[model samples]
Target: SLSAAEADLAGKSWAPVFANKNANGLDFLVALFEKFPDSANFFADFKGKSVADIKASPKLRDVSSRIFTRLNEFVNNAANAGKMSAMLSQFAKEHVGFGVGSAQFENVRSMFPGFVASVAAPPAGADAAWTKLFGLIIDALKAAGK
Candidate 1:
C-alpha cells in the first residue's frame, strides 16, 4: 500500500514544503480560514479577529501546531496501524462538535496540496501519494465519526 512508501516519502519531503518549529504554524489555519470562511466559524478564537490578532493568538498557534504535528505523526506512523489509528481517532474526536466533518477534511486535503504546490514543489508523483495519504487518514475519520 501507499502508507509505508508514501509515509517514508513525506517524512523526507514535508519539511521542504511545510512550516515551523516555531509558532507561525498558524500559517495553514490562516490560509484555510481565508479560503473557507464557513469552516472558520468552527474556531472559537477566530471570531471577530483580524489577521494580526489571528497571527498573534496563542490558541491559533497551539491548535495549528497540533494539526501540523499530527500530520507529521501520521506520516511517521503510517506503517503502524496501532499508532496511526490513534492519531486518526484524536482528529476524529477533536472535530466531533467543531463543525469539522469529512467535508471539511476533504477541503483541507484539496487546499493543502495546492498551498504546498505553490510554495515548494513536492516530490515527483506527489498527487498519488497525497491522494492515498489523505484517503487513509480521512477514511478513518469518516468511520470513527458520529
Candidate 2:
C-alpha cells in the first residue's frame, strides 16, 4: 500500500513533468519494443513489426493514444490508490481478450522503469511506491481475468 505521503509525492512529480515525459506514451512504447519485442504480438497490425515501423505507422496512432491515455489516468490518479480498482478492471476485460496474461504484465513491468526514467524519473521512494501500486493493479487484474 502507498502511504498518503508517498502518493502525494507521486502526485507532485506527475504534474508538468510526466506529461512532457510520457510524450503520449511514445517513449514507453519505444522502450517496450526495445526491451520486449515479443510484445508486438499483442497487436495484430503491429505483429512482427519493427520498432521503427510502429513509430512511423499512422494507423497505429489511435491504439498508441489509447495506451497513453490509460497510463495517464493511472499516473494522474496516483494519489487515489483505491481508484485503481475500477480503472484497472475497466481495461482488464479488453486486455484478456488480447491474451495479456502474466507474460505481458511481467514484460512491461520489467522495462517500465526505463520508460519512466526516459521521461520523468520518480522521486527516491516513488519507484517502490509505484511498484506497490502496480502490484495491486496487476494482481487484481489477473484475478479478474481468471
Candidate 3:
C-alpha cells in the first residue's frame, strides 16, 4: 500500500500517454537533460555513488532507483503511453519537497528517451536486462523509506 505521501504524489496528473517508440522517447529524455548544467551536476553527483557518499546517501539512491523504475514501467506499458504530464506532476509532488523542482524534473524527463534508446539499442533480448536494472532502482527507492 502507498503511504499518504506516496498516494498524494501518485495521484497527481500525469502527462498524456504517447505511442512513440521507447528508444526514440528515451533519446529525447537524454537530450533534454543535456540542456541543463545544474541538472547534469545533480545527476552525476548521485548516479553510481556508494551508499556512504556525502552527496548520495544510500537512502537517496534507493528512492531514486525506485522512482526511475516506476517511470520505466510507465513508459513501457502501453496503457501509460503519452501520459507525461500526469507522471511529471506526480513526480514533482513527490520530489519537490525534497529540493527537486521543475528544472530538475525537466532535465530527468528529457534524458529518459535517450536512456531508453541506449538500452533498447543493446544486443537483442537486452530488454530483460534493462527491466532488471529498473527493478533494482525500485528496490533502492523502497530501501529509502526507512
Candidate 4:
C-alpha cells in the first residue's frame, strides 16, 4: 500500500504517461522486447517477428493499449489497496492462462521502473513511490503463481 504522499506523487507523475497511453505503451513494450528478447516469445503476436514488423502489427498496439489501461488503473487506485489487489488478482488469473508465471511476470521489473522514470521525469520522491508500487504489483503477480 502507498502512503498518501506516495499516492499523490505517483498519480501526478503518471498523468503524462496516461495521457499518451497508446504511444507510450507501445514504446514500453518495445523497450521490453529490445532488452529481453526472450520476452517476445511469450507473446504469440510478437514471436519470431522483427522489431519493425512488431511495430507495424495492430495486435501489438491493441495489447499495448490494454497494458497501459491497466497501468493507469493501478496508478489511480494506488491508495486503495483492496481495489489494487483485486485488480491484480484478476490480472494474474487472466495472464496465468496465457502461461505467465512468476519468472515471466518478474521480467517487467527489469524494465518498468527505468522506463517510467525516463518517460515521466517524475519529481524527487515520485520515483521511489512508483518503484514501491511496482514492487507491490510484481509481488502480487508472483504470489498468484503459487
Candidate 5:
C-alpha cells in the first residue's frame, strides 16, 4: 500500500522547482552529509570522513544522492499529510542493519522541505494530484500501522 501511494506521487508530472537543474537535489544531501559524515562514526562504520568526501567519491556519490532524493520525497509527502512518523517506522523496519538511528532520521526530516520545494512548482492540476497522492499515503500508513 505504501508502495502504491508512493507510485501515485511519483507518477504525477510535477515540475522542477530549481532553476539550476544540476543542483536540484544537492542541497538537502549536502546539508545532511555535513551533519552526519561517516568519518564521525556517529552511528555505524562511517567515521573519520566528511560527508562531502563521501558524496564526492565516484562510487558512493550517485547512490548517496539517490537515497537523499528518495528520502526527501518520502518525508515531504508524508509530512504534508502528517504521516512522517509512520513512514519513518516503516523505513526503520526495512533498514535494520543499516545503522540508521532516530537522529539521522531527524536529519532527513529536517532537510525534506527544501528538497520538496525544489521540485514542487507543479502546474495547476498537479497540486490536486499531489494532494490525492499524499492522502493515499496517509491512509495506507494508517491502515498498516506504519
Candidate 6:
C-alpha cells in the first residue's frame, strides 16, 4: 500500500504526464526502443525499422497512448493496495502471450521513474514515491509471469 505522502506525490507527479500522455508516451517508447533495441522484437510494427520510420508511424502513437492509459489507471488506483496489485497481476497475465517477462518489466522499471521525473519535474521526494509504486507493479508482473 502507498503511504499517504507517496500517494500525493504519485498523483501530483502523474498529472502532467497523464495530461500529455500521447506525446509523452511516444517519447517514452522511443526512449525505450533507443535504450533497448532488442525490445523492438515484441512489436512487429517496430521491428527492423529505423527510428525515424518508427516515430513517423501512427501505430507508434496509438500504442503509446494505450500504454499511458493503463498507467493512468494504475496511478488512479494507487490508494488501494489490493486493487492495484490485482490490476498489475492481471496486466502481466494478459501480456504473457506476447512474451513479456521480468526482463521487459525490469527494463521499464529501471528507467520509468527517471523518465517521469524528467517529464513532470516533481518534488524532491517524488522519485522515491514513484519508485515504491513501480516496485509493486514490477513485483506483480514478475510474480504473475512465473
Task: Assess each prediction's global lDDT (C-alpha) against the native.
Answer: 0.71, 0.68, 0.40, 0.81, 0.48, 0.81
lDDT of 4: 0.81
Q: Between the candidate structures 1 and 5, which one is better when assessed by lDDT?
A: 1
Q: Compose the digit string of candidate 1's lDDT tens values, residues 31-131.
A: 88778777766778677776667777777767887777777767667778787777777778777657567887788888877766765778876666776
Best by TM-score: 6
By lDDT, the better pick of 1 and 6 is: 6
Query: Candidate 3: which stretches are off by over 4 Å?
Result: 1-37, 40-61, 76-90, 122-146
The worst-scoring run of ten residues by lDDT in candidate 3 lies at 9-18
Ranking by lDDT: 6, 4, 1, 2, 5, 3
Off by more than 4 A, model 4: none
Model 6 C-alpha lDDT per residue in residues 9-55, reported as the tens digit of each score: 88888898877877898999999988888888888788898778889
Residue 27 local lDDT, model 1? 70
**Which ten contiguous residues of candidate 6 have the minimum total lDDT?**
137-146
lDDT (tens digit, per residue) of candidate 4 on 1-146: 79889999988888877778788889988988888888888788888998888888989988898888888888888888789878878887787778776676567776666887777677789878877887886677677773
For model 3, what is the C-alpha lDDT against the true structure? 0.40
Task: For model 3, state the Cα shift of residue 14 in Å.
Answer: 18
Of candidates 4 and 2, the better by TM-score: 4
Model 5 agreement with the true structure over 72-141: per-residue lDDT tens digits: 5663564243465556456555544454444444445454444555566444454444444445444443
lDDT of 3 by residue, 32-105 (tens): 43455454334534454433352334344444445445755553442332453355445545654465544454
